[PDB]
Design a protein around this ligand. Structure first.
Ligand SMILES: O[C@@H]1[C@@H](O)[C@H](O[C@@H]2CO[C@@H](O[C@@H]3CO[C@@H](O)[C@H](O)[C@H]3O)[C@H](O)[C@H]2O)OC[C@H]1O
Ligand SMILES: O[C@@H]1[C@@H](O)[C@H](O[C@@H]2CO[C@@H](O[C@@H]3CO[C@@H](O)[C@H](O)[C@H]3O)[C@H](O)[C@H]2O)OC[C@H]1O
Ligand SMILES: O[C@@H]1[C@@H](O)[C@H](O[C@@H]2CO[C@@H](O[C@@H]3CO[C@@H](O)[C@H](O)[C@H]3O)[C@H](O)[C@H]2O)OC[C@H]1O
Ligand SMILES: O[C@@H]1[C@@H](O)[C@H](O[C@@H]2CO[C@@H](O)[C@H](O)[C@H]2O)OC[C@H]1O
Ligand SMILES: O[C@@H]1[C@@H](O)[C@H](O[C@@H]2CO[C@@H](O)[C@H](O)[C@H]2O)OC[C@H]1O
Ligand SMILES: O[C@@H]1[C@@H](O)[C@H](O[C@@H]2CO[C@@H](O)[C@H](O)[C@H]2O)OC[C@H]1O
Ligand SMILES: O[C@@H]1[C@@H](O)[C@H](O)OC[C@H]1O
Ligand SMILES: O[C@@H]1[C@@H](O)[C@H](O)OC[C@H]1O
Lengths: 436, 436
């Protein structure tokens, strides 16, 4: 079922999930995508400390169960997030310290895991316990101030509460092997395994942005932890800008490590993101698939046999043999493109950007002035509009992110001068193109 | 005066205005920008038919004077918009026809211009009277069915009401000289001027987008109308995606036409735009100046003494005599840039795009990881974020759109390897650059 992320992921024995917000489950557009694309669910906030234990000793699972129920009803496994954490603690817990806090921490773990016993695949037992100052030490929080052994205690408590669950330590900025934080978590996990402290997995949040960017050494980081005898999981994936290349790279890294269980993107649509401003997810506001969605799916399906055109390249249609060409190498906005015999000419050299654009001349974008059939495909100044973004389907077609339509040679004409338009996608040779 | 659009425009005897919404005059961030940047105002809706005459015979100038007064008290002239139009007519007018309507049009023109007699610089007497079907003929409206001569009557009536006001015919899609609509309006005005019909100006709304793209022949259109003996004005300018080149082009088209009175953009911030989705204005919602803002300001001030580079060029520091360089021509995201002896190489070839990016390698963007002083300036995959958009100030400084900070050579360093950071613009030589 290589047509959806979850099913594609399943072809390598992995899962592909998302974070579900219970308040969005009544949104049909939202649930339609969520249910179809993922086979793993994480509650975005519903299973956190403040949501599950509002007052000390009083547990509440109405919010968490709404997410859980929806997940199982739709055939998805669930990752519990999160049991021990310095953030989003209910007021009563924030005011605790020392042994009083230590026991509350333990009491909380028993209460939540007990309620969900035998129903959770993975639990992020402890979340973000290391600092970002750069020395890879522990984050100073009320939890850490109860004693360095609090994490160990949390894991032992969790194991006893629900032995069927995989116990994960979850954190961010621990993807780049060169960062001190990453090495600090490694040493802790190694220490745990050596002394018999219960831990089965390490979750790498994977919140990538220009501040803490993706680095190919992520694969080694994954291998390094995997070699300690624990599984690894990409738990909260989102990339600032949503580079197609970066999304594909992350996917291939996980697929390269046998112990990488799966990938969870932190949200469904960009509009649902905790950082919508970074348009970091795979679907945009209107629910359409972004260029990065296609790159992720293709990556899950094993990628392509031959490497795409590195910088520049021509787009040749199979049912014509001609290359996508801008009439008379013009650079005037609003110029409808056409089919024409191939040759070395800039007005026939298109570049597919990580943003999903098909640029010509370096700053002119394949543009669609409309969303319906017949819409002329032209060139317009690049500005990032969804009508300037395209997805390159494995079947050789090129669909408009905004329109959902495919680049179509009018009347299936193959002769030179044949204009390009937007028409319902098919499989006709007048809609398939070959990178070169 | 050359730090604000209005002032820069004033240098050539022109003006630079915007459309003011009475409901936003209580928003200090709105007015802080409006009062500072523009010296001409058009009420976005407050002076239209339905707003000034909710019932035949009874005029309500409250909202209108609110805008007019704010304008005058803040040193701005006013464009009256608009006296006779098929849109936004009150309910009672939308039903009138023939004679009674013709008389209603006249009375309305008399009432409004009477109230504002001698206070209005330009009045859009007639708005959008030609259709977009491609015939080049009049639009079929209750107003047109009263007699093809309605437009002539409106102008004769207007001249009578207030002879001190320049009377304009305003429309959209009349910017491209090759369009039939444009010719339809051209012939009418030519006829009017010959037969003596009182008309002083033609307003070009200038709403450019992928559907009706800006075309360089726009200057030809302006020059052809100017030749007829009428003034011309860019009345409701907004460019989809707000390309710097296009904004600069339209500005130069006006500066090249002795009869072009000035330029008005249809709104203050992108969030105030009637078409926010197209982010077609000069200011972002947070109030920051967009790349296009600087392109317009530079254009109004007479452009750069030397013709700016055309994609893929070097950026050399004035104080160091060294170029903006990507260490070892690395392509990895997060790599901070440096200064280095200038030489022909891709890691020194920067392309400034219409969106305001400084690209390298084709799909890598000069990127600011944060917004405070000391923020590292690096390269990151291009995605259109404001932390990847820059303004090329005429003084040679390069300011980040998001941060409002200038590219800065750390500690005024001048040697190879000096790193680049963001910092408060200081006019220092380590913040000045020459593009070649
Ligand atoms: O709630 C959590 C967020 O607070 C957390 O924020 C991360 C903070 O660090 C960011 O990267 C920094 C970039 O600048 C360097 O100097 C710092 O050393 C880096 O840590 C990172 O991008 C943010 O996401 O993210 C996880 C949330 O749960
Ligand atoms: O007002 C509260 C909101 O600010 C709060 O926002 C949530 C904060 O956590 C987000 O998820 C985290 C992302 O970073 C990872 O490192 C963490 O592990 C995640 O838990 C979540 O997406 C936001 O919605 O939600 C509750 C509001 O009351
Ligand atoms: O609900 C009403 C709104 O829909 C209405 O929107 C205004 C419509 O006119 C816009 O200005 C015109 C843009 O097109 C040009 O050709 C015309 O000449 C302009 O007048 C204006 O910006 C919108 O706000 O406003 C009133 C609401 O009640
Ligand atoms: O205007 C006409 C187009 O609308 C028409 O479009 C075709 C519809 O059927 C699809 O299978 C074809 O691929 C598509 O081109 O083509 C003829 C043109 O005159
Ligand atoms: O209300 C009017 C709009 O309907 C009008 O729309 C234009 C129609 O033609 C297209 O080519 C243009 O892109 C589009 O803006 O614009 C003027 C406005 O007053
Ligand atoms: O390289 C940086 C200098 O360019 C920077 O210069 C300061 C800019 O702001 C002005 O108000 C100060 O007077 C001036 O010194 O200082 C920091 C340095 O790293
Ligand atoms: O765009 C076409 C150009 O590429 C070709 O060389 O000559 C014919 C033109 O229409
Ligand atoms: O990036 C620099 C490169 O351009 C120069 O040639 O050698 C030194 C490098 O740091």
């Amino acid at each position: 079922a290589e047509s959806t992320l979850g099913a594609a992921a399943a072809q390598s024995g992995r899962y592909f999930g998302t974070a579900i917000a219970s308040g969005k489950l009544g949104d049909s557009a939202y649930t339609t995508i969520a249910s179809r694309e993922f086979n793993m669910v994480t509650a975005e906030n519903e299973m956190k400390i403040d949501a599950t234990e509002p007052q000390r000793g009083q547990f509440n699972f109405s919010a968490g169960d709404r997410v859980y129920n929806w997940a199982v009803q739709n055939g998805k496994q669930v990752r519990g997030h999160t049991l021990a954490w310095h953030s989003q603690q209910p007021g009563w817990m924030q005011s605790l310290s020392g042994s009083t806090l230590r026991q509350a921490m333990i009491d909380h773990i028993n209460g939540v895991m007990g309620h969900y016993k035998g129903k959770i695949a993975q639990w992020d037992v402890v979340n973000e316990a290391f600092s970002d100052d750069g020395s890879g030490g522990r984050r100073d929080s009320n939890l850490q101030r109860t004693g360095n052994d609090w994490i160990e205690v949390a894991f032992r408590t969790a194991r006893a509460a629900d032995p069927a669950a995989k116990l994960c330590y979850n954190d961010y900025n621990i993807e780049n092997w060169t960062w001190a934080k990453t090495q600090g978590v490694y040493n802790m996990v190694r220490d745990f395994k050596q002394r018999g402290v219960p831990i089965d997995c390490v979750g790498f949040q994977s919140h990538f942005n220009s501040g803490s960017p993706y680095n190919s050494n992520f694969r080694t980081t994954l291998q390094n932890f995997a070699a300690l005898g624990v599984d690894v999981a990409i738990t909260e994936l989102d990339i600032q800008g949503a580079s197609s290349s970066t999304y594909a790279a992350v996917t291939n890294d996980c697929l390269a490590v046998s112990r990488c269980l799966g990938i969870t993107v932190w949200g469904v649509r960009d509009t649902d993101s905790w950082r919508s401003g970074d348009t970091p997810l795979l679907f945009n506001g209107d629910g359409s698939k972004k260029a990065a969605y296609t790159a992720v799916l293709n990556a899950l399906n094993g990628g392509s046999s031959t490497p795409p055109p590195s910088g520049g390249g021509q787009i040749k249609g199979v049912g014509s043999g001609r290359c996508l060409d801008v009439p008379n190498a013009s650079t005037t906005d609003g110029t409808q493109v056409q089919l024409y015999d191939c040759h070395s000419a800039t007005n026939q050299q298109w570049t597919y950007t990580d943003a999903g654009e098909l640029r010509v001349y370096g700053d002119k974008c394949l543009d669609a002035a409309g969303t319906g059939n017949g819409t002329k495909v032209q060139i317009y100044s690049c500005w990032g509009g969804d009508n300037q973004k395209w997805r390159l389907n494995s079947d050789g077609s090129i669909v408009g992110v905004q329109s959902g339509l495919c680049l179509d040679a009018v009347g299936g004409g193959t002769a030179n001068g044949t204009l390009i338009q937007l028409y319902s996608c098919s499989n006709g040779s007048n809609q398939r193109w070959t990178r070169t």
